[PDB]
Design a binder for these strands. Sequence first.
DNA 1: ACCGCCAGAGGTAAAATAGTCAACACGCACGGTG
DNA 2: CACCGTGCGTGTTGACTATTTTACCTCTGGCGGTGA
Lengths: 73, 51
Amino acid sequence: DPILLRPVDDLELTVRSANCLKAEAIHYIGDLVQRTEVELLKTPNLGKKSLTEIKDVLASRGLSLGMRLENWP
Amino acid sequence: FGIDMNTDYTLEEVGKQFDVTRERIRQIEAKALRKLRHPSRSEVLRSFLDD
DNA sequence: ACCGCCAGAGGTAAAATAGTCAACACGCACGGTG
DNA sequence: CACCGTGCGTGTTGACTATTTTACCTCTGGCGGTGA
């Protein structure tokens, strides 16, 4: 989807969440959505509030977790 | 900048009213600018950018 | 017809002011542990 | 649920450089006095 390949910067996340993503080196939303709640919690320095924010922002645009993508990019 | 007013007040008077020493008010102004800069808040203002 | 005289318009100095670039307290706030 | 240990946003100097005006020389137009 055109929206997924956009970088996480446009996702309008917090500074701590942005730093966590940078540490995870997740470029595209398409790659991020493939993951799940537990896998996201595996990331250090990230608590329940950050994951809740990520879920809320993904749901605002209608995005969620669990969708498996192939040949992406 | 002077939006809805009659002078482009410099930082000194803005600090007088907002109590500070320039560098903080400079700080407040830059955040706002980088903010209005990201997409999702500057598409129509971009349109007004003759291209 | 000529010749000495006057004032408006530029290039370079110099003083003043504004914008630019890295540390310390301090109070919330998040995360570990019980 | 409760308590304590860091993280981090929120307010604070000092030294440096880039406009900005203001004033000082110099060109170069205009000008009027004086003359069968």
